[PDB]
Short mmCIF file of C-alpha atoms and ligand atoms in Angstrom, two decimals:
data_model
loop_
_atom_site.label_atom_id
_atom_site.label_comp_id
_atom_site.label_asym_id
_atom_site.label_seq_id
_atom_site.Cartn_x
_atom_site.Cartn_y
_atom_site.Cartn_z
CA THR A 1 12.44 -11.43 -5.84
CA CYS A 2 14.33 -8.87 -4.04
CA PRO A 3 17.74 -7.71 -6.05
CA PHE A 4 21.18 -7.75 -4.58
CA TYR A 5 21.48 -3.99 -5.21
CA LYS A 6 18.58 -2.99 -2.35
CA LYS A 7 20.14 -5.41 0.61
CA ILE A 8 23.17 -4.24 2.73
CA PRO A 9 25.23 -6.84 3.47
CA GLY A 10 26.58 -8.39 7.43
CA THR A 11 23.22 -7.40 8.18
CA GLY A 12 19.37 -8.06 8.06
CA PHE A 13 18.45 -4.50 6.22
CA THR A 14 17.46 -3.83 3.25
CA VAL A 15 16.25 -0.56 1.40
CA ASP A 16 13.32 0.79 -0.56
CA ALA A 17 12.34 -3.32 -0.81
CA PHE A 18 8.42 -3.49 -0.24
CA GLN A 19 7.14 -5.17 -3.47
CA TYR A 20 9.34 -8.11 -3.08
CA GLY A 21 7.09 -10.28 -0.31
CA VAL A 22 8.70 -11.58 2.81
CA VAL A 23 12.12 -10.67 1.78
CA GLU A 24 14.74 -13.46 3.10
CA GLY A 25 16.75 -13.00 6.34
CA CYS A 26 15.30 -9.05 6.62
CA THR A 27 14.32 -8.10 10.03
CA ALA A 28 14.09 -4.33 9.11
CA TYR A 29 13.22 -2.66 5.57
CA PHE A 30 14.68 1.09 5.52
CA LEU A 31 12.32 3.22 3.38
CA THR A 32 14.28 6.59 2.06
CA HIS A 33 11.48 8.64 1.19
CA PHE A 34 7.39 8.69 0.23
CA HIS A 35 7.81 8.15 -3.85
CA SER A 36 5.78 5.20 -4.75
CA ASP A 37 8.37 3.67 -6.98
CA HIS A 38 9.97 3.36 -3.58
CA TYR A 39 7.39 2.10 -1.44
CA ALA A 40 5.42 -0.02 -3.45
CA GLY A 41 3.85 -2.76 -1.72
CA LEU A 42 3.53 -1.24 1.87
CA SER A 43 -0.23 -0.84 2.83
CA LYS A 44 -2.00 -1.80 6.88
CA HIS A 45 -1.42 -5.14 5.89
CA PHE A 46 2.89 -4.80 6.93
CA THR A 47 3.43 -6.16 9.86
CA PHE A 48 7.43 -5.69 10.34
CA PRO A 49 9.11 -2.87 11.51
CA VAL A 50 10.07 0.28 9.35
CA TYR A 51 12.85 2.89 9.91
CA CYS A 52 12.41 6.20 8.14
CA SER A 53 12.11 9.91 8.82
CA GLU A 54 9.21 11.41 10.86
CA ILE A 55 7.83 13.13 8.13
CA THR A 56 7.96 9.78 6.44
CA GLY A 57 6.40 7.76 9.02
CA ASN A 58 3.40 10.92 8.64
CA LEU A 59 2.71 9.82 5.77
CA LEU A 60 2.66 5.77 6.27
CA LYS A 61 0.37 6.44 8.75
CA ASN A 62 -1.77 9.06 7.42
CA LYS A 63 -1.94 8.21 3.77
CA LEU A 64 -1.28 4.24 3.33
CA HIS A 65 -2.96 3.59 6.95
CA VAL A 66 0.20 1.47 8.58
CA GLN A 67 -0.36 0.41 11.84
CA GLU A 68 1.90 2.68 14.55
CA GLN A 69 3.04 -0.08 16.20
CA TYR A 70 5.25 -0.67 12.82
CA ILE A 71 6.24 2.62 11.85
CA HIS A 72 9.97 3.47 13.79
CA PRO A 73 11.09 6.80 12.67
CA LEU A 74 14.50 8.35 14.13
CA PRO A 75 15.92 11.82 13.74
CA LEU A 76 18.70 13.30 11.77
CA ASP A 77 21.92 13.73 12.38
CA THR A 78 21.45 11.64 15.29
CA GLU A 79 23.56 7.90 16.39
CA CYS A 80 20.54 5.14 16.77
CA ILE A 81 21.37 1.59 17.14
CA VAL A 82 19.27 -0.83 15.28
CA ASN A 83 18.90 -4.56 15.65
CA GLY A 84 22.56 -4.07 16.76
CA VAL A 85 23.74 -2.07 13.98
CA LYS A 86 24.84 1.62 14.18
CA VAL A 87 22.79 3.86 11.87
CA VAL A 88 22.45 7.61 11.04
CA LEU A 89 19.76 9.45 8.50
CA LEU A 90 21.19 12.73 6.78
CA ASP A 91 19.22 14.93 4.46
CA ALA A 92 19.20 14.09 0.63
CA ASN A 93 18.28 17.53 -0.52
CA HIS A 94 15.28 15.43 -2.28
CA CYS A 95 11.51 15.68 -1.48
CA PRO A 96 10.06 16.69 2.01
CA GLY A 97 10.90 13.87 4.22
CA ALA A 98 13.96 11.89 1.92
CA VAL A 99 17.36 11.19 3.78
CA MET A 100 20.43 8.88 2.84
CA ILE A 101 21.72 6.14 5.49
CA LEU A 102 24.53 5.64 7.02
CA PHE A 103 25.41 1.91 7.86
CA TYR A 104 28.49 1.26 10.54
CA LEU A 105 28.52 -2.50 9.45
CA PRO A 106 29.99 -4.84 12.59
CA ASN A 107 32.81 -5.74 10.77
CA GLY A 108 34.24 -2.22 10.16
CA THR A 109 32.94 -1.75 6.74
CA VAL A 110 30.68 1.51 6.30
CA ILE A 111 27.84 2.30 3.95
CA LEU A 112 26.32 5.50 2.58
CA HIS A 113 23.13 4.55 0.84
CA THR A 114 21.84 7.82 -1.05
CA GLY A 115 18.95 6.60 -1.74
CA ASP A 116 17.47 10.34 -4.55
CA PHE A 117 19.12 12.74 -3.04
CA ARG A 118 19.63 16.23 -5.02
CA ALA A 119 24.27 16.42 -3.80
CA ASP A 120 25.11 20.00 -2.32
CA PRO A 121 28.86 21.41 -0.98
CA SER A 122 26.45 21.74 2.20
CA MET A 123 27.32 17.47 2.36
CA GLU A 124 30.81 17.71 3.03
CA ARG A 125 30.00 19.21 6.38
CA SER A 126 27.86 16.75 7.66
CA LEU A 127 28.55 13.89 9.70
CA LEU A 128 30.45 12.41 6.41
CA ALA A 129 33.04 14.97 7.07
CA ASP A 130 34.75 12.33 9.89
CA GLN A 131 34.97 9.35 7.88
CA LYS A 132 36.08 6.80 5.22
CA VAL A 133 33.04 5.10 3.26
CA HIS A 134 33.64 1.86 1.35
CA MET A 135 31.08 1.30 -0.71
CA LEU A 136 28.53 3.98 -2.15
CA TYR A 137 24.96 3.54 -3.17
CA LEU A 138 24.26 6.66 -5.48
CA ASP A 139 21.32 7.72 -6.87
CA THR A 140 22.62 8.23 -10.59
CA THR A 141 19.74 9.61 -12.40
CA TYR A 142 21.55 11.80 -14.06
CA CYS A 143 25.21 9.95 -14.23
CA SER A 144 25.97 11.53 -17.74
CA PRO A 145 27.05 15.50 -19.01
CA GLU A 146 24.68 16.37 -21.04
CA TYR A 147 22.57 16.66 -17.90
CA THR A 148 22.62 20.61 -17.09
CA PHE A 149 19.74 22.43 -15.18
CA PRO A 150 20.20 25.68 -12.95
CA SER A 151 20.01 25.90 -9.59
CA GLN A 152 16.16 26.03 -7.39
CA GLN A 153 16.76 29.56 -6.70
CA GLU A 154 17.53 30.59 -10.02
CA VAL A 155 14.12 28.95 -11.17
CA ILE A 156 12.01 30.39 -8.57
CA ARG A 157 13.28 33.45 -9.54
CA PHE A 158 11.71 32.67 -13.06
CA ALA A 159 8.40 31.58 -11.32
CA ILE A 160 7.93 34.11 -8.84
CA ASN A 161 8.96 37.15 -11.50
CA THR A 162 7.10 35.47 -14.73
CA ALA A 163 3.55 34.96 -12.16
CA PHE A 164 4.05 38.17 -10.27
CA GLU A 165 3.90 40.28 -14.10
CA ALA A 166 1.25 38.39 -15.41
CA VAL A 167 -1.37 39.23 -12.45
CA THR A 168 -0.08 42.68 -12.36
CA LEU A 169 -1.11 43.24 -15.54
CA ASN A 170 -3.75 41.25 -15.15
CA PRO A 171 -5.51 40.99 -11.76
CA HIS A 172 -8.36 38.42 -13.42
CA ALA A 173 -5.92 36.01 -14.09
CA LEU A 174 -5.42 32.52 -12.68
CA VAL A 175 -2.26 30.71 -11.82
CA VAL A 176 -2.80 26.91 -12.05
CA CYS A 177 0.29 24.52 -10.45
CA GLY A 178 0.77 20.52 -11.82
CA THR A 179 1.36 18.08 -8.98
CA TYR A 180 1.66 14.26 -8.83
CA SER A 181 3.83 13.39 -5.61
CA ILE A 182 5.10 15.36 -2.90
CA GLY A 183 8.67 17.68 -3.53
CA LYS A 184 9.08 20.87 -5.27
CA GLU A 185 6.61 22.85 -3.01
CA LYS A 186 8.41 25.99 -3.10
CA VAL A 187 7.47 26.10 -7.19
CA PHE A 188 3.56 27.03 -5.86
CA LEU A 189 4.40 28.32 -2.37
CA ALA A 190 6.53 30.66 -3.47
CA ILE A 191 4.27 32.13 -6.05
CA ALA A 192 1.19 32.33 -3.51
CA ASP A 193 3.36 34.55 -1.19
CA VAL A 194 3.91 37.10 -4.07
CA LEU A 195 0.67 37.40 -4.83
CA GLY A 196 -0.98 37.21 -1.67
CA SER A 197 -3.22 34.45 -1.91
CA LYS A 198 -3.45 30.69 -0.07
CA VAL A 199 -2.81 27.54 -2.74
CA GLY A 200 -6.21 25.56 -3.24
CA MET A 201 -6.19 22.45 -3.53
CA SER A 202 -8.09 18.76 -3.37
CA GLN A 203 -9.07 17.41 0.05
CA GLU A 204 -6.22 14.70 -1.00
CA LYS A 205 -3.29 16.61 -1.51
CA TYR A 206 -4.33 19.18 1.31
CA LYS A 207 -4.11 15.84 3.19
CA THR A 208 -0.52 15.19 2.15
CA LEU A 209 0.93 18.45 2.55
CA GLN A 210 -0.74 18.27 6.21
CA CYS A 211 2.03 15.69 7.06
CA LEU A 212 5.16 17.45 6.04
CA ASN A 213 6.12 19.74 8.78
CA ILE A 214 6.24 22.60 7.06
CA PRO A 215 6.48 25.87 9.35
CA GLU A 216 3.23 28.28 9.71
CA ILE A 217 1.85 25.64 6.69
CA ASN A 218 -2.63 26.70 8.20
CA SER A 219 -1.06 30.40 6.81
CA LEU A 220 -0.60 28.91 3.39
CA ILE A 221 -2.57 26.30 2.20
CA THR A 222 -6.75 25.31 1.40
CA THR A 223 -9.30 23.73 0.48
CA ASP A 224 -11.25 26.87 -0.58
CA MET A 225 -10.74 27.26 -4.52
CA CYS A 226 -12.89 30.05 -4.55
CA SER A 227 -10.35 32.27 -1.92
CA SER A 228 -7.50 31.49 -3.93
CA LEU A 229 -5.62 32.68 -6.78
CA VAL A 230 -2.88 29.86 -7.18
CA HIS A 231 -4.80 26.45 -7.85
CA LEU A 232 -2.98 23.37 -7.84
CA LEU A 233 -4.17 20.13 -10.33
CA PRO A 234 -2.71 16.96 -11.18
CA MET A 235 0.13 16.95 -13.51
CA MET A 236 -1.85 15.15 -16.34
CA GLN A 237 -4.56 18.02 -16.19
CA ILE A 238 -1.96 20.64 -17.41
CA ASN A 239 -2.99 20.75 -21.24
CA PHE A 240 -4.75 23.07 -23.00
CA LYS A 241 -7.82 20.92 -22.64
CA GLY A 242 -7.60 19.80 -18.91
CA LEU A 243 -7.53 24.06 -18.31
CA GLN A 244 -9.98 24.99 -20.56
CA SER A 245 -12.06 22.43 -18.36
CA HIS A 246 -11.19 23.61 -15.32
CA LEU A 247 -11.16 28.07 -16.17
CA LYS A 248 -15.46 27.54 -17.17
CA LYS A 249 -15.53 25.49 -13.33
CA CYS A 250 -13.71 28.42 -11.32
CA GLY A 251 -17.44 30.94 -12.40
CA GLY A 252 -16.27 33.81 -14.83
CA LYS A 253 -13.55 34.86 -12.17
CA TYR A 254 -11.18 34.72 -14.01
CA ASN A 255 -10.18 35.37 -18.14
CA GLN A 256 -6.51 33.65 -18.22
CA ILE A 257 -4.52 31.15 -17.10
CA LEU A 258 -0.83 30.69 -16.49
CA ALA A 259 -0.12 27.08 -15.80
CA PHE A 260 3.53 25.78 -14.66
CA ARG A 261 4.92 22.21 -15.54
CA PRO A 262 7.60 21.06 -13.16
CA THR A 263 9.55 18.59 -14.72
CA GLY A 264 13.32 17.54 -14.12
CA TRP A 265 15.66 17.55 -17.50
CA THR A 266 14.48 17.66 -20.68
CA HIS A 267 15.99 18.11 -24.53
CA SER A 268 15.08 22.17 -24.14
CA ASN A 269 17.74 22.12 -21.17
CA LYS A 270 20.85 21.53 -23.56
CA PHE A 271 19.76 24.97 -25.28
CA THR A 272 17.70 27.61 -23.38
CA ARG A 273 18.31 29.02 -20.51
CA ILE A 274 16.04 29.78 -17.28
CA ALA A 275 15.68 33.83 -18.45
CA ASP A 276 14.98 33.38 -22.37
CA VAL A 277 12.42 30.34 -21.53
CA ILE A 278 9.28 30.89 -23.19
CA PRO A 279 5.68 29.04 -23.01
CA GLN A 280 3.21 27.30 -25.24
CA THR A 281 -0.07 29.50 -26.11
CA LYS A 282 -3.15 29.13 -27.48
CA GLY A 283 -5.83 31.85 -26.83
CA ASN A 284 -5.99 32.88 -23.13
CA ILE A 285 -4.00 30.08 -22.19
CA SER A 286 -0.30 29.85 -21.40
CA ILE A 287 1.79 26.61 -20.19
CA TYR A 288 5.71 26.91 -18.64
CA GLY A 289 7.93 23.59 -18.22
CA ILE A 290 10.29 24.71 -15.60
CA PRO A 291 13.53 22.48 -15.21
CA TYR A 292 13.22 22.19 -10.94
CA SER A 293 15.15 19.43 -10.39
CA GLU A 294 15.49 17.51 -7.20
CA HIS A 295 18.68 14.53 -8.43
CA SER A 296 21.95 15.94 -8.93
CA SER A 297 23.52 17.10 -11.74
CA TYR A 298 25.98 15.50 -13.59
CA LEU A 299 28.45 18.13 -11.97
CA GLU A 300 26.92 17.77 -8.73
CA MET A 301 27.07 14.09 -8.49
CA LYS A 302 30.89 14.56 -9.58
CA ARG A 303 31.93 17.14 -6.82
CA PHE A 304 29.76 14.69 -4.04
CA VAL A 305 32.10 12.07 -5.09
CA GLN A 306 35.32 13.18 -5.67
CA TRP A 307 35.07 14.50 -2.44
CA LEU A 308 33.92 11.72 -0.14
CA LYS A 309 36.21 9.19 -2.24
CA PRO A 310 34.74 5.65 -2.04
CA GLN A 311 35.99 2.76 -2.59
CA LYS A 312 33.25 0.84 -4.67
CA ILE A 313 30.24 2.67 -5.97
CA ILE A 314 26.35 0.77 -6.48
CA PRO A 315 24.33 2.28 -8.93
CA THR A 316 21.04 2.34 -7.94
CA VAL A 317 19.51 4.14 -11.35
CA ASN A 318 19.75 3.11 -14.89
CA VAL A 319 20.15 -0.16 -13.78
CA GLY A 320 18.38 -1.65 -16.47
CA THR A 321 20.72 -1.61 -19.47
CA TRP A 322 24.24 -2.93 -20.84
CA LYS A 323 25.07 0.71 -22.41
CA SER A 324 24.10 2.39 -19.32
CA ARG A 325 25.62 0.47 -17.03
CA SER A 326 28.91 0.88 -19.16
CA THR A 327 28.79 4.69 -19.74
CA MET A 328 28.01 5.40 -15.57
CA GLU A 329 31.07 2.71 -15.20
CA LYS A 330 33.56 5.01 -17.39
CA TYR A 331 32.20 8.05 -15.44
CA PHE A 332 33.54 6.04 -12.19
CA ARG A 333 36.81 5.67 -13.49
CA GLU A 334 37.36 8.96 -14.89
CA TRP A 335 36.94 10.59 -11.88
CA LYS A 336 38.72 8.33 -10.01
CA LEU A 337 41.96 8.85 -12.29
CA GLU A 338 41.87 12.77 -12.09
CA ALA A 339 41.27 12.83 -8.61
CA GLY A 340 43.84 10.66 -7.63
CA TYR A 341 41.79 8.50 -4.78
C1 AWS B 401 -7.96 38.54 -20.90
C2 AWS B 401 -6.94 38.17 -21.38
C3 AWS B 401 -6.49 37.02 -21.68
C4 AWS B 401 -5.05 36.43 -22.06
O1 AWS B 401 -4.80 35.90 -22.23
O2 AWS B 401 -3.69 37.59 -21.84
C5 AWS B 401 -4.40 38.58 -21.12
C6 AWS B 401 -3.18 39.69 -20.65
C7 AWS B 401 -1.75 39.69 -21.23
N1 AWS B 401 -1.60 39.90 -22.78
C8 AWS B 401 -1.14 41.19 -23.00
C9 AWS B 401 -2.34 38.90 -23.66
C10 AWS B 401 -3.67 40.86 -20.39
O3 AWS B 401 -2.78 42.36 -20.47
C11 AWS B 401 -4.69 41.14 -20.05
C12 AWS B 401 -5.95 40.84 -20.42
C13 AWS B 401 -5.34 39.02 -21.45
NI1 NI B 402 12.18 10.05 -5.71
#
């Protein structure tokens, strides 16, 4: 059954609540983004209204075959009335099509649901600048000060420079990038752009990228693997055995693989600056773990919440243990006492 932190009180609305059957009293189901833990349960057999971004709607239609009559895309940064309640969708700076949702309740209460987000100072000049938020439903994925990582820009600079050096030294090297979901497309797009190549991938992954409204996409991606020296593979194949196997299939075009595994945070972020990152190597294969995050760092999250000054915070991640819950509650109180709200 549907948990309390996925319900929006005083409305008929739920958020990211498709795996619980028919939810009692739910007249409209919101979907913040197309990641599997959030869409779990949606299919061609779903017959209630779904509200989401245009990009999320494209993915629902083409990947999950949800019927067009039930998909309700909304524009960003625009006041919309849904079942008698004013709502706004805001860019979440997560994966393509990901949104935060502002709900203006009939009783005067204002709720922000962040979905999954990477907090940024640019959000301080969205439609949030105006007004008071009474309740914040917060992506607390990395809510502890040990969680540090670089900017996305710094990580992409490292990846571009690393790939360009390797292929200029050896014109017969292949670059491989791992993926298991939408998000983090800049990693493979930036590498292909510096190398003058299209990105080669499966038919299934090509279909997914065609749903994302990325400008000039037809110029950047392909299903013709032989025409490309940047290949995308499933994340599970980014290991010495899987990469050895892939190199065999390329028909003696290549004699080296440089591979990237975009992760989130790992314990090596504790002690290794992005510039000092080194790969795991076996023979003619090297693998780089790069900390490309689409979730807020601790510091980014703290700045956002101290700016917004919500009256109450409801975490939506790390909710399952008493230790996690107590830790998060202690940080929220510190933030409030430091800033004075
Ligand atoms: C064939 C080959 C395999 C490999 O793993 O690395 C290479 C490098 C990179 N450093 C120097 C080892 C080259 O510069 C040139 C060729 C290769
Ligand atoms: Ni997500």
